[PDB]
GROMACS .gro file of N, CA, C and O in nm:
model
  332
    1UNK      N    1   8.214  13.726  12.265
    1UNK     CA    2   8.149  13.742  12.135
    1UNK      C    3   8.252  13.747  12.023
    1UNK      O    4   8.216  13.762  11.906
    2UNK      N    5   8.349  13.739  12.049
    2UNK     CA    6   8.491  13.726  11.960
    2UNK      C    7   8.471  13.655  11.866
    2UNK      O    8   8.474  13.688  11.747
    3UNK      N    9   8.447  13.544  11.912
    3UNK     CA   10   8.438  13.404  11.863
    3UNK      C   11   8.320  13.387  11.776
    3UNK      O   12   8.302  13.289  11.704
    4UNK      N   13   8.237  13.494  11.788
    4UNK     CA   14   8.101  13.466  11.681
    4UNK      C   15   8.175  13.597  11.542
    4UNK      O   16   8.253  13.691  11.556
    5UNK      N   17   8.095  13.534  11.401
    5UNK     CA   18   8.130  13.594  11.268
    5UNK      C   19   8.263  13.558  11.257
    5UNK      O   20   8.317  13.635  11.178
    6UNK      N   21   8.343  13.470  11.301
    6UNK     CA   22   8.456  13.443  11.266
    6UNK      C   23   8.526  13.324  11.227
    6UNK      O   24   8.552  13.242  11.315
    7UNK      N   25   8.562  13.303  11.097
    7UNK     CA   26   8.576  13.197  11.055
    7UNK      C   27   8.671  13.077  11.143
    7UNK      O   28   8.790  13.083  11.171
    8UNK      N   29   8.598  12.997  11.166
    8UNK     CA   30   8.662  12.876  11.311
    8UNK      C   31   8.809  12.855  11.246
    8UNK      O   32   8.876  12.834  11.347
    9UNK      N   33   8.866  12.850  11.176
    9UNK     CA   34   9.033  12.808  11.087
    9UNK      C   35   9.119  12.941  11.149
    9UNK      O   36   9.227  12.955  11.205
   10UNK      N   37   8.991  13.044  11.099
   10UNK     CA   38   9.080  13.163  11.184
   10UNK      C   39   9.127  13.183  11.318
   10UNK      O   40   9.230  13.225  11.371
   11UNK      N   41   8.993  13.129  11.363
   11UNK     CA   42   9.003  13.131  11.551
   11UNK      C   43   9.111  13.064  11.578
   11UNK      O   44   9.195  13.115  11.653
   12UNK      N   45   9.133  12.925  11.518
   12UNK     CA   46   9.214  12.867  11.510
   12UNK      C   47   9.407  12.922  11.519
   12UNK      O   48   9.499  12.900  11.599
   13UNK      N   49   9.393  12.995  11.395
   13UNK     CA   50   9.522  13.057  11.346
   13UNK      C   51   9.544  13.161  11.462
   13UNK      O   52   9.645  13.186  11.527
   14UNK      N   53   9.448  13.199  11.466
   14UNK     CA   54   9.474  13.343  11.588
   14UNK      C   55   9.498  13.301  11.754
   14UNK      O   56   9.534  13.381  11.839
   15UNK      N   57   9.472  13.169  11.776
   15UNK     CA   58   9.499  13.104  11.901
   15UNK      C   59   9.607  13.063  11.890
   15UNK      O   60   9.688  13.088  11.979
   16UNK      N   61   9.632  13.013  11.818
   16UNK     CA   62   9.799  12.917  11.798
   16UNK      C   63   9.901  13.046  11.770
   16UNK      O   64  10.008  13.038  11.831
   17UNK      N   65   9.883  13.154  11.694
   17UNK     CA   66   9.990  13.249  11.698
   17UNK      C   67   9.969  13.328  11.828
   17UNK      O   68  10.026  13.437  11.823
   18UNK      N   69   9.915  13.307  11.924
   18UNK     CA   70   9.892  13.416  12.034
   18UNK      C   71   9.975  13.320  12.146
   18UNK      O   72  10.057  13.382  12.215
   19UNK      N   73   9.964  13.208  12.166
   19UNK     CA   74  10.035  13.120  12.240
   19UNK      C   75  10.147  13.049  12.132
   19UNK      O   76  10.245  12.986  12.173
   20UNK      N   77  10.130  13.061  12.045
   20UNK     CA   78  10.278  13.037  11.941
   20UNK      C   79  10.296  12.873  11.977
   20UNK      O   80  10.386  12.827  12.047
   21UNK      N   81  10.189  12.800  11.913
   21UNK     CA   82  10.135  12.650  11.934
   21UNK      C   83  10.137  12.576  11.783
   21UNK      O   84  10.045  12.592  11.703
   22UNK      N   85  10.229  12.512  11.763
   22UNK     CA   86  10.237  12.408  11.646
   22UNK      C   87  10.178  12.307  11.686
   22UNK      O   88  10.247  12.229  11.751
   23UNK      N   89  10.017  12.269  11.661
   23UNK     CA   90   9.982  12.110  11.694
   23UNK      C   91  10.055  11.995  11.597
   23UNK      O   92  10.110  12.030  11.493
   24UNK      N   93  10.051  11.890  11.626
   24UNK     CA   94  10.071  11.760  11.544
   24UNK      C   95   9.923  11.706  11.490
   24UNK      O   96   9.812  11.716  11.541
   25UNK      N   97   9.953  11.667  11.410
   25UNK     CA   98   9.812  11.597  11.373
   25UNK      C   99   9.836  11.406  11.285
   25UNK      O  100   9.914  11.367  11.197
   26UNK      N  101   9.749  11.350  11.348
   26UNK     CA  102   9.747  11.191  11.303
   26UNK      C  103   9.672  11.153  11.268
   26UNK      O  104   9.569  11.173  11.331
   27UNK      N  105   9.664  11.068  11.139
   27UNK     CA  106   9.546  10.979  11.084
   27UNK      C  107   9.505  10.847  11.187
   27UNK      O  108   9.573  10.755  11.232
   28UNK      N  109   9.334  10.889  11.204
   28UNK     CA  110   9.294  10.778  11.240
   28UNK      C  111   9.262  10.651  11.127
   28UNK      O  112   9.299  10.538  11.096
   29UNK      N  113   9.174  10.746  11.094
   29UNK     CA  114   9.094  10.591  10.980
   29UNK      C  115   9.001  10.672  10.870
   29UNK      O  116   8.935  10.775  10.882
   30UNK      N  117   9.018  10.609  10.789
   30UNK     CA  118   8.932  10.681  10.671
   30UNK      C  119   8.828  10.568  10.638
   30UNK      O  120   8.866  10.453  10.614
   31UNK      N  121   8.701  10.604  10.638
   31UNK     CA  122   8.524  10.511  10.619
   31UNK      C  123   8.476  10.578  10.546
   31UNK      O  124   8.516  10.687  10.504
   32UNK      N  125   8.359  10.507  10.514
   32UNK     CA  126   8.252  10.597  10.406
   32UNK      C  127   8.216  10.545  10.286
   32UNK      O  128   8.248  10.433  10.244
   33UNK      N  129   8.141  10.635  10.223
   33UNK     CA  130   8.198  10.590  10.053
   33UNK      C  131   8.287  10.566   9.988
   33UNK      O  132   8.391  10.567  10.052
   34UNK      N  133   8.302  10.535   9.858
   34UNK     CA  134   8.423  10.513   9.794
   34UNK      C  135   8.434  10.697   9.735
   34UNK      O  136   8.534  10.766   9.752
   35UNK      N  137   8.312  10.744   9.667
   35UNK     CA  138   8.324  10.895   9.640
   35UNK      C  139   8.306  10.984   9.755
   35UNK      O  140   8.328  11.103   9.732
   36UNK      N  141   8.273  10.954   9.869
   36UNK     CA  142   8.242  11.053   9.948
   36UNK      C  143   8.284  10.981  10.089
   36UNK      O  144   8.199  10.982  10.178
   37UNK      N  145   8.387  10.930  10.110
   37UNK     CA  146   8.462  10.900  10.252
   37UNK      C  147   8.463  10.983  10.330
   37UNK      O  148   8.446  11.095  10.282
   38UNK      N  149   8.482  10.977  10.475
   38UNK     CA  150   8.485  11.023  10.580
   38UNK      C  151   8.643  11.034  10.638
   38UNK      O  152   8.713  10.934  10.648
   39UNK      N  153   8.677  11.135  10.664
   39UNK     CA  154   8.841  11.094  10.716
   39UNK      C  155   8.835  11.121  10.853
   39UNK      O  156   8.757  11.208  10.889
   40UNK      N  157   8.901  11.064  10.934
   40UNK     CA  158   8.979  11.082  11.089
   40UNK      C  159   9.040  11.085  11.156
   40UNK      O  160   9.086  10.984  11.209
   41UNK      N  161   9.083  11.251  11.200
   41UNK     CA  162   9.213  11.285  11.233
   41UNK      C  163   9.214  11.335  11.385
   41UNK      O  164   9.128  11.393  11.450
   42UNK      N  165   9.344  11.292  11.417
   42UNK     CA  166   9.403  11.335  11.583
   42UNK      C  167   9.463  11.395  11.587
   42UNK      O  168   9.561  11.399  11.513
   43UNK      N  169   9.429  11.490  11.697
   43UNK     CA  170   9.534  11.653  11.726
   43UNK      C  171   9.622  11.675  11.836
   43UNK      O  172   9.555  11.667  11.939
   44UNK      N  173   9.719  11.694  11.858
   44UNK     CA  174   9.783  11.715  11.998
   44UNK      C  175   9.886  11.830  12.047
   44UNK      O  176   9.978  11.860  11.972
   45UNK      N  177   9.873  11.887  12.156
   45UNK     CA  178   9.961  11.975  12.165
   45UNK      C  179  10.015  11.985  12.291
   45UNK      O  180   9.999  11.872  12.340
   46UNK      N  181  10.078  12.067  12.386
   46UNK     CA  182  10.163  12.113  12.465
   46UNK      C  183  10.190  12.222  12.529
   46UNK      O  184  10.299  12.277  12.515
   47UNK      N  185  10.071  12.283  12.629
   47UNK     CA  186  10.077  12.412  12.681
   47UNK      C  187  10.041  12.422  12.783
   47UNK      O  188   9.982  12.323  12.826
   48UNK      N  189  10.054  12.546  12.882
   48UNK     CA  190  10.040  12.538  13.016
   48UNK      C  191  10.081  12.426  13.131
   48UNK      O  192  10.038  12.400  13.243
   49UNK      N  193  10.177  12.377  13.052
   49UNK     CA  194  10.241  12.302  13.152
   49UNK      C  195  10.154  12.132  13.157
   49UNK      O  196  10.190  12.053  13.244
   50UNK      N  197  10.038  12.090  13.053
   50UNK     CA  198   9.989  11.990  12.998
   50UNK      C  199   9.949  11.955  12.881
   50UNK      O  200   9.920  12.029  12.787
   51UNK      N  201   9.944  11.802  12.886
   51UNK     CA  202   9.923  11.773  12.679
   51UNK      C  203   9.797  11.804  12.667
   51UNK      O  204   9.733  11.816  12.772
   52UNK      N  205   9.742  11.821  12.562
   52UNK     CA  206   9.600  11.849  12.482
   52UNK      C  207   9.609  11.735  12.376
   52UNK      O  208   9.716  11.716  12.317
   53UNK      N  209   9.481  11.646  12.345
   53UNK     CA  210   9.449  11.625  12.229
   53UNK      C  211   9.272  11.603  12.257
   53UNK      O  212   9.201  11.597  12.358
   54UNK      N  213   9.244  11.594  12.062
   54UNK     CA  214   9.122  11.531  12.068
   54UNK      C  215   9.121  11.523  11.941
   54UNK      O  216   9.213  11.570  11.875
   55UNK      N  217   8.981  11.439  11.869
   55UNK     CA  218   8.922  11.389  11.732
   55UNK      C  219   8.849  11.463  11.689
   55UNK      O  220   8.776  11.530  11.761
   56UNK      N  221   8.849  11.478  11.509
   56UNK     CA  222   8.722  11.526  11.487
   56UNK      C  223   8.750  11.433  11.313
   56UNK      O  224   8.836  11.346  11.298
   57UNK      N  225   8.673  11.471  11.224
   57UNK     CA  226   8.641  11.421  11.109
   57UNK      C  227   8.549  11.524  11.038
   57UNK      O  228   8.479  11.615  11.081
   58UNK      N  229   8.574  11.480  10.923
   58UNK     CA  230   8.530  11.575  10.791
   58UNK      C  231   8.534  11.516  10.674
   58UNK      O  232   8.566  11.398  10.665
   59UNK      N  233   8.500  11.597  10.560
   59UNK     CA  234   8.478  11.483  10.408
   59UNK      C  235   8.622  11.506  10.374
   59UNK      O  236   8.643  11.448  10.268
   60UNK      N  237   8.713  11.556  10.411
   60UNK     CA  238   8.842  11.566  10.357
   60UNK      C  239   8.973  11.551  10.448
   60UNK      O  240   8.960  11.550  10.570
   61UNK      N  241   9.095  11.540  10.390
   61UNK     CA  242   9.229  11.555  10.513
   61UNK      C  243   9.214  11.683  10.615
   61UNK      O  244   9.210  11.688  10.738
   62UNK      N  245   9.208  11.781  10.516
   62UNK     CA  246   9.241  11.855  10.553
   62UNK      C  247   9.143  11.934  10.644
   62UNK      O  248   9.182  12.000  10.740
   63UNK      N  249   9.015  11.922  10.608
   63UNK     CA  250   8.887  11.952  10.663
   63UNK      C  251   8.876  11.863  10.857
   63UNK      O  252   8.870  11.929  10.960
   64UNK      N  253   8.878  11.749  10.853
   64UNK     CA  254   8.928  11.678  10.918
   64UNK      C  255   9.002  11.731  10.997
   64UNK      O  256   8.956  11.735  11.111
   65UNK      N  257   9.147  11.796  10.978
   65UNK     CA  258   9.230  11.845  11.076
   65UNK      C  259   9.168  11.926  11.153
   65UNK      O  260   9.185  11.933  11.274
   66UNK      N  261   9.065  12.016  11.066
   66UNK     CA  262   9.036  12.172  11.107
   66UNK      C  263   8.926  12.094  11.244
   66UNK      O  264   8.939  12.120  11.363
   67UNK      N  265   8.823  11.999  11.183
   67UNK     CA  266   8.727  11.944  11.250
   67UNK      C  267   8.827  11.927  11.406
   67UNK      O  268   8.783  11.980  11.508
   68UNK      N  269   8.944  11.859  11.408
   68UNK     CA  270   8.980  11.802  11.537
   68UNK      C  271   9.042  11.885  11.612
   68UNK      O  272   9.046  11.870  11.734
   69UNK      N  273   9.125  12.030  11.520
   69UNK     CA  274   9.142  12.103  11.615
   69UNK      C  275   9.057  12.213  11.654
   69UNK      O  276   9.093  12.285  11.747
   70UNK      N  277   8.906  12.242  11.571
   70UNK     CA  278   8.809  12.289  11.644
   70UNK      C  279   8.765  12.233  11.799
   70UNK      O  280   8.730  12.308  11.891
   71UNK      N  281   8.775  12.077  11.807
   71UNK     CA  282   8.722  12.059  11.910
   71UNK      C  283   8.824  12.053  12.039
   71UNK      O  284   8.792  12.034  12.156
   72UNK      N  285   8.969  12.076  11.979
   72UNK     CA  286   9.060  12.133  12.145
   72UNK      C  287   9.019  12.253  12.150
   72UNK      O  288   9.042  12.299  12.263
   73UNK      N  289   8.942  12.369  12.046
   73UNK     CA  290   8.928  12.498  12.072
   73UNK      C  291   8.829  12.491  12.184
   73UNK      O  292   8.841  12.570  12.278
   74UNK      N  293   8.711  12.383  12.181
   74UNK     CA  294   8.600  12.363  12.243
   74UNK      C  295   8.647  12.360  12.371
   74UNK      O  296   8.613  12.431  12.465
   75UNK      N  297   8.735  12.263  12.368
   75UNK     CA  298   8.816  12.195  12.517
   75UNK      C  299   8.877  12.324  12.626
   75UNK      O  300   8.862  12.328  12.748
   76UNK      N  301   8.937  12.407  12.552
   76UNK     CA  302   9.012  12.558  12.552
   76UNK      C  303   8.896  12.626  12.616
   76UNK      O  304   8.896  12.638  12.739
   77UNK      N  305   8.811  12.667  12.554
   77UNK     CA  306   8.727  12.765  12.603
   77UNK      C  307   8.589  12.718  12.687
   77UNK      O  308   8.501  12.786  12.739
   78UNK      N  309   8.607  12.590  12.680
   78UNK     CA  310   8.465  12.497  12.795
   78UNK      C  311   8.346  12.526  12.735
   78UNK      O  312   8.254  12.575  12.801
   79UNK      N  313   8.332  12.496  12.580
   79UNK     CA  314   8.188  12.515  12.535
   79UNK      C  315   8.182  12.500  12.401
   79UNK      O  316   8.293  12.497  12.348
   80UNK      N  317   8.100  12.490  12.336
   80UNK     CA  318   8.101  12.496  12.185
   80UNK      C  319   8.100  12.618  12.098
   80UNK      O  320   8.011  12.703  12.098
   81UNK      N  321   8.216  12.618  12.019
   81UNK     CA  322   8.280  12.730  11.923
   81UNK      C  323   8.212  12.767  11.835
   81UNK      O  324   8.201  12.696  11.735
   82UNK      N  325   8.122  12.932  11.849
   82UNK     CA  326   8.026  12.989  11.783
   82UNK      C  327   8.060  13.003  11.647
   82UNK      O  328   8.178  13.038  11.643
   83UNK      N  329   8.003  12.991  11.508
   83UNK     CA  330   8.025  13.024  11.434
   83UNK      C  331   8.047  13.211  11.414
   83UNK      O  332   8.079  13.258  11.305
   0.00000   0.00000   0.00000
C-alpha cells in the first residue's frame, strides 16, 4: 500500500535512491499535433545483475520520461503502479 497516495515521480525518486540507479533515457519519436504533440521516450538501466528498459509517452519531454520510467516501475513490482 506504499505505493498508493504517492506521487508516481516520487516512487520513482525513492526507488532509484534506495538502489542508487541513474537511468538513461532516449528519444523515440515525437507525433501528434503541431500544438499538442505526443513525445516518445526510452528508459534503461542496470541492476541485479540485468539490463532493464521500456517505453512510455506523454504531452511533454519530460512527462514522457516520467511515463517510461513508470512503466520499468510496473516491470519492478509485476503490476500496475497505484496512484
Amino acid at each position: 500500500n506504499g505505493l498508493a497516495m504517492k506521487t508516481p515521480v516520487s516512487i520513482l525518486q525513492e526507488l532509484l535512491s534506495r538502489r542508487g540507479i541513474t537511468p538513461g533515457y532516449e528519444l523515440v519519436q515525437i507525433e501528434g499535433a503541431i500544438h499538442e504533440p505526443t513525445f516518445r521516450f526510452r528508459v534503461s538501466f542496470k541492476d541485479k545483475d540485468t539490463p532493464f528498459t521500456a517505453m512510455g509517452a506523454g504531452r511533454s519531454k519530460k512527462e514522457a520520461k516520467h511515463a517510461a520510467a513508470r512503466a520499468l516501475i510496473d516491470k519492478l513490482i509485476g503490476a500496475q503502479l497505484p496512484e
